[PDB]
């Protein structure tokens, strides 16, 4: 036990030091179940321990692996930003950087006024769905005059 610290702050977000290490770091945006397992496998960490049982140099090893996947031989087919449209790079985007990357994508579609950008602006379904009977969020209207 050692009565060690059981809440910790990692990338401007709070991790509970109380779940299994592979399910604690998925509190970061851009890190799902599948990616969190592969990062800890490259970092040489035992998956059996609770997240409050890592030492100070073990968390810095995990953080420096999450920010640079391609230098620790994580494959290109794993990553969430592929050939990024403005500069051609491959990377994983995390935390408040993922919010801004979506914010730039919706404005890029709106500025040229393509059909995607207009559907996102009017608040309608963007992909191929019908709209007669599903997604209702207004109020019932009466027939009376």
């Amino acid at each position: 036990p050692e009565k060690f610290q059981h809440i910790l702050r990692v990338l401007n977000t709070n991790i509970d030091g109380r779940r299994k290490i592979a399910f604690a770091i998925t509190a970061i945006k851009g890190v799902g179940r599948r990616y969190a397992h592969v990062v800890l496998r490259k970092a040489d960490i035992d998956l059996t321990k609770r997240a409050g049982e890592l030492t100070e140099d073990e968390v810095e090893r995990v953080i420096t692996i999450m920010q640079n996947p391609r230098q620790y031989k994580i494959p290109d087919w794993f990553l969430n930003r592929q050939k990024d449209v403005k500069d051609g790079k491959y990377s994983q985007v995390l935390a408040n950087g993922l919010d801004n990357k979506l914010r730039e994508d919706l404005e890029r579609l709106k500025k040229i006024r393509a059909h995607r950008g207009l559907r996102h602006f009017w608040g309608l379904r963007v992909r191929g769905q019908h709209t007669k009977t599903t997604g209702r969020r207004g109020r019932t209207v009466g027939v009376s005059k």
Partner: protein, 75 residues
């Protein structure tokens, strides 16, 4: 609406109780240890395997969905 607050690791006030309570119970199982000590089921599973290797309890039965243990062959 309510919340439990079960522990993930022991402290001496509950670990000494784990070793003192062994003769009291006719039936020993991870769920009855969990609710009585305020312990998670994964810590209750781990604690009962240590007492077995210490020789303090008897395994009655094992299956994927249910283990059963009992007091050490008297009382």
């Amino acid at each position: 609406r309510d919340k439990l607050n079960n522990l993930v690791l022991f402290d001496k006030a509950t670990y000494d109780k784990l070793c003192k309570e062994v003769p009291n119970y006719k039936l020993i199982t991870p769920a009855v240890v969990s609710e009585r000590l305020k312990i998670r089921g994964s810590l209750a599973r781990a604690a009962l395997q240590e007492l077995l290797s210490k020789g303090l309890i008897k395994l009655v039965s094992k299956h994927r969905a249910q283990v059963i243990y009992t007091r050490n062959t008297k009382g």
